[PDB]
From a paper:
Chondroitinase ABC I (cABC-I) is the enzyme which cleaves the β-1,4 glycosidic linkage of chondroitin sulfate (CS) by β-elimination. CS is a sulfated polysaccharide composed of repeating of D-glucuronic acid (GlcA) and N-acetyl galactosamine (GalNAc) with a β1–3 linkage. Recently, cABC-I was used to treat lumbar disc herniation.
The overall structures of cABC-I bound to these disaccharides were almost identical to those of the unbound form (Cα r.m.s.d.: cABC-I-ΔDi-4S complex, 0.131 Å; cABC-I-ΔDi-6S complex, 0.161 Å; cABC-I-ΔDi-0S complex, 0.217 Å), indicating that cABC-I was not conformationally changed by interaction with disaccharides.
Author numbering: 25 to 137, 140 to 164, 188 to 270, 273 to 985, 990 to 1021
The structure:
């Protein structure tokens, strides 16, 4: 506390704190005749002393402090977010008081003299009080008096007060509690309950106790976001440093606990040097509860009975300190927003310490406390299934903590009702198709957070959701098979689109830091072993592959011999993110577009700044293993030249998102994505359309870009390429990778190139091989540049300069000012000798493929190596073709004429929804030439032709095997 008034314009944001750790500590204080003010060092919040206020009923004391109380607007302008001036203090009751403390604000007040508020005193322990001076009183610029009036209807009493504070606080976070009413309330959990109820039986009680044990097993036998500490010496050293002591007639003394979010009320960056030194003695709750958990784990594993006893007493003393500090039912502590970050490992510690809390008579208090602070999470914790229940962050950060809370419920029948309802809630959350872009699993196996397919969020959710199902397995609380089935689909999908990292195009806002299935490995075992007929051989075989375990190792893990999964082969369509995956030997190709329903990129204030082209019809080739080792190196990476994309090469200042904070740029139409045929062949259709009027986006930049993927190869074609500037700087990237001692070689037309720097220009009939063994045969292009060069770039978070040496090749479209085009072919198993053979086949009247149409309405590609035809209907159209005659919606159709059968697949990659609406099926009428007979696709001969009726739901392809009619 200074001589300056509260909210002094020298620094509005500099808190005035009465902590009493200064010279002449009661200077600013006066009492009426019926109050006595002391310093007591027996408990405190900040510094080592608090104010002991002895009083007769109706008596007052006064703080003499001038307040220049700012408007919310002024507070807000000073801080930079919505703010209010707050009055806050801590008080301790050794005994409950049946009445109210009145806090009054005025000018030159005495016991007998504007606005004020009430604090109910019917509690024991520390409580915090915090009110908006502008918004929570029942204030003119002359206020200099804060009067504390003991209740009138109570003959006498005693209250300890510390850390009386005037500060600027976030206007969201003065919360109402059992002591103080504010304008803000987080209402208490009201648990849903499912009928019929399971009875308390020995069986149902044993199952509850097995689920608790199984949770204990997971936490004592590595968790992300858990700072594990197994050295007892260290746990004891950290504990002693808390300086906790039991006091005589109840409570503790020790270092004050505060959450990472609660500190905001002090404005720590603006504290005077005196206060900050004291504030620096606080303990952050996250660290404290992590310690409580690490102690609980050691206690469980401890074989020495003396060390075990000590670890228990340390845990119970930390629990006692935590409760006495006011982390109890009905104590808001002004706010506990983002509660999970401070408490997740407290929840879990209570499972390990459940019998110790029972014996110490602490279970009910710790249950009431955790349930109270859990009210922040009411939307999930009430356990009523809703459109929002499939939240992937919940599955990651809260789902096990939720179960732990329910398992801590003291009544047996209520605990069974809660866990039964939880089983139903998780089954619904894992089964339902959330409407619009709401979080959760999808029917193509994508898994959405931030309104799109998002591996970075789904991967941790898969791990913990699998673990939950496994914790509940083979009990009356087991998750329904519908939830198990849907999660299997999402997890098998993730195995398909990862190798073992997701491609650049699936990296979300973290390009070059893709999530890895290696982080999800244990979820494959959990889900495998929690099958209705365990183990699921598919999931088990994936677990072994991803974890690098042998067939020999399988019998002990799964209880039967299982061959580790070989890498998946063929083509898989995932229109949930407007992508598809082509797999051949150890390579995966991520083909990715975007549309109205699929954002191109997530770009934040300090993430993915240069990500504009993340989804620009990219076709990133990844062999099994580290992408960095394959030359996907952030440093010096040309963000313009994402593999397979058609882009405008821009300076980074212009490629950078035009929003300083968040942009998730969606496309201009529903249609773009992939389709599949026979699980083996794929096609991408990408309609590249820019917004009419977004800064730095050329409104006339267009392309049509199709890819047909079969076996060891991909045929890439593009048409209708334009920009505002006659295709100046318009380019299609064949590849880009870093040059290293292991990635040092390019082949051009049978010549090894290792020089750095190197440039050349190629055209139709030329080929290359990159250092990753991909061959590129140029089949239509006037100018392809090849470069080995030093590149300067900037990193995607803070735009700081980077540099590196790269091999790349791109088509220069500036040679065709209007409706530029390209064609080229990739071989995934290229060698100089085989690329020589592919080039000869190309010169033999193009033995490789034929483009049957390439215009704004349709792209048609006959692959002569695979004998498959792909049809990208960018617009409904009648066409001339051997198989297909007409399609009445934008669609992707594929055909394969085997011996005596014609296989036809169709889809629209258009998911047919909005951010709000549920996806509904699109009916696609595909007319085919000739008379056919037979899958849920319907067919009807009509004249010399056959009408196929396809139902396209969430961009999920359908196919039908047709045989000819005489
Ligand atoms: Mg103090």
């Amino acid at each position: 506390a200074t001589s300056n008034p509260a909210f002094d314009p020298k620094n509005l944001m500099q808190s005035e704190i009465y902590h009493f750790a200064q010279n002449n500590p009661l200077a600013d204080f006066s009492s009426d005749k019926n109050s006595i003010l002391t310093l007591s060092d027996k408990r405190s919040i900040m510094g080592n002393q608090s104010l002991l206020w002895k009083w007769k009923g109706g008596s007052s004391f006064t703080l003499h402090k001038k307040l220049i109380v700012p408007t919310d607007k002024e507070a807000s302008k000073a801080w930079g977010r919505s703010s209010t001036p707050v009055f806050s203090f801590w008080l301790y009751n050794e005994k409950p008081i049946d009445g109210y403390l009145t806090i009054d604000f005025g000018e030159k007040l005495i016991s007998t003299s504007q606005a004020g508020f009430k604090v109910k005193l019917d509690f024991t322990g520390w409580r915090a009080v915090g009110v908006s001076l502008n918004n929570d009183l029942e204030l003119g610029a002359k206020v200099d008096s804060i009067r504390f009036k003991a209740p009138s209807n109570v003959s006498q009493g005693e209250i300890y007060i510390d850390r009386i504070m005037f500060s600027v606080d976030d206007a969201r976070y003065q919360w109402s509690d059992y002591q103080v009413k504010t304008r803000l309330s987080e209402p208490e959990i009201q648990f849903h309950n499912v009928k019929p109820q399971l009875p308390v039986t020995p069986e149902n009680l044993a199952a509850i106790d097995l689920i608790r044990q199984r949770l204990i097993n997971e936490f004592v036998g590595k968790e992300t976001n858990l700072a594990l500490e197994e050295n007892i010496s260290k746990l004891k050293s950290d504990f002693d440093a808390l300086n906790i002591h039991t006091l005589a007639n109840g409570g503790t003394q020790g270092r004050h606990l505060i959450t990472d979010k609660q500190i905001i009320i002090y404005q720590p960056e603006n504290l005077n040097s005196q206060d900050k030194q004291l504030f620096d003695n606080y303990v952050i709750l996250g660290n404290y509860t992590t310690l409580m958990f690490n102690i609980s784990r050691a206690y469980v594993l401890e074989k020495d009975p003396t060390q075990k006893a000590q670890l228990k007493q340390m845990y119970l003393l930390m629990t006692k300190h935590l409760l006495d500090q006011g982390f109890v039912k009905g104590s808001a502590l002004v706010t506990t927003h983002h509660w999970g970050y401070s408490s997740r490992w407290w929840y879990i510690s209570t499972l390990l310490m459940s019998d110790a809390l029972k014996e110490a008579n602490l279970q009910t208090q710790v249950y009431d406390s955790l349930l109270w602070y859990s009210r922040e999470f009411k939307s999930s914790f009430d356990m009523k299934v809703s459109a929002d229940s499939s939240d992937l962050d919940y599955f990651n950060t809260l789902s096990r903590q939720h179960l732990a809370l329910l398992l801590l419920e003291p009544d047996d029948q209520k605990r069974i009702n809660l866990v039964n309802t939880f089983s139903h809630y998780i089954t619904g959350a894992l089964t339902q198709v959330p409407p619009g872009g709401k979080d959760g699993l999808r029917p193509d196996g994508t898994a959405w957070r931030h309104e799109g397919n998002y591996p970075g969020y789904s991967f941790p959710a898969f791990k913990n959701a699998s673990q939950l199902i496994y914790l509940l397995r083979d009990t009356p609380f087991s998750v329904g098979e519908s939830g198990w089935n849907n999660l299997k689909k999402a997890m098998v999908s993730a195995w398909i689109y990862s190798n073992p990292e997701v491609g650049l195009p699936l990296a979300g806002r973290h390009p070059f830091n893709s999530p890895s299935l290696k982080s999800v490995a244990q979820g494959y075992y959990w889900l495998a072993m929690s099958a209705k007929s365990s183990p699921d051989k598919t999931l088990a075989s994936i677990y072994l592959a991803i974890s690098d375990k042998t067939q020999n190792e399988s019998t002990a893990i799964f209880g039967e011999t299982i061959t580790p999964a070989s890498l998946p082969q063929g083509f898989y369509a995932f229109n949930g993110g407007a992508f598809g995956i082509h797999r051949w030997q150890d390579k995966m190709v991520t083909l990715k577009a975007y549309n109205t329903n699929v954002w191109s990129s997530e770009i934040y204030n300090k993430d993915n700044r240069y990500g504009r082209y993340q989804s620009h019809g990219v076709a990133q080739i990844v062999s099994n293993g580290s992408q960095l080792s394959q030359g996907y190196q952030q440093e010096g990476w040309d963000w313009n030249r994402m593999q397979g994309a058609t882009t405008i090469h821009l300076p980074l200042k212009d490629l950078d998102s035009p929003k300083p904070h968040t942009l998730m740029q969606r496309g201009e139409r529903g249609f773009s994505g992939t389709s599949s045929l026979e699980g083996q062949y794929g096609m991408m259709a990408f309609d590249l359309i820019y917004p009419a009027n977004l800064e730095r986006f050329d409104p006339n930049f267009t392309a049509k870009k199709s890819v047909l993927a079969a076996d060891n190869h991909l045929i890439f074609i593009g048409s209708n390429i334009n920009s505002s500037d006659k295709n100046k700087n318009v380019e299609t990237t064949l590849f880009q990778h870093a040059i290293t001692p292991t990635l040092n070689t390019l082949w051009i037309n049978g010549q090894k190139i290792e020089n750095m720097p190197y440039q050349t220009t190629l055209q139709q009939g030329d080929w290359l091989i990159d250092s990753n063994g991909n061959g590129y045969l140029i089949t239509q292009a006037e100018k392809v540049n090849v470069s080995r060069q030093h590149q300067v770039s900037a990193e995607n978070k803070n735009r700081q300069p980077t540099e590196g040496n790269f091999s790349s090749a791109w088509i220069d479209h500036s040679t065709r000012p209007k409706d530029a085009s390209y064609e080229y072919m990739v071989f995934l198993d290229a060698t100089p000798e085989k690329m020589g053979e592919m080039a000869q086949k190309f010169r033999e009247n193009n033995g490789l493929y034929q483009v049957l149409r390439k215009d704004k309405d349709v792209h048609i590609i006959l692959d002569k190596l695979s004998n498959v035809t792909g049809y990208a209907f960018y617009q409904p159209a009648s066409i001339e073709d051997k198989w297909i005659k007409k399609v009445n919606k934008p669609a992707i159709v594929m055909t394969h004429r085997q011996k005596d059968t014609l296989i036809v697949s169709a889809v629209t990659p258009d998911l047919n929804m909005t951010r709000q609406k549920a996806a509904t099926p699109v009916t696609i009428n595909v007319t085919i030439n000739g008379k056919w007979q037979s899958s849920e696709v319907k067919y009807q001969v009509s004249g010399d032709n056959t009408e196929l009726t396809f139902t396209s739901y969430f961009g999920i392809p359908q196919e039908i095997k047709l045989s000819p009619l005489p």
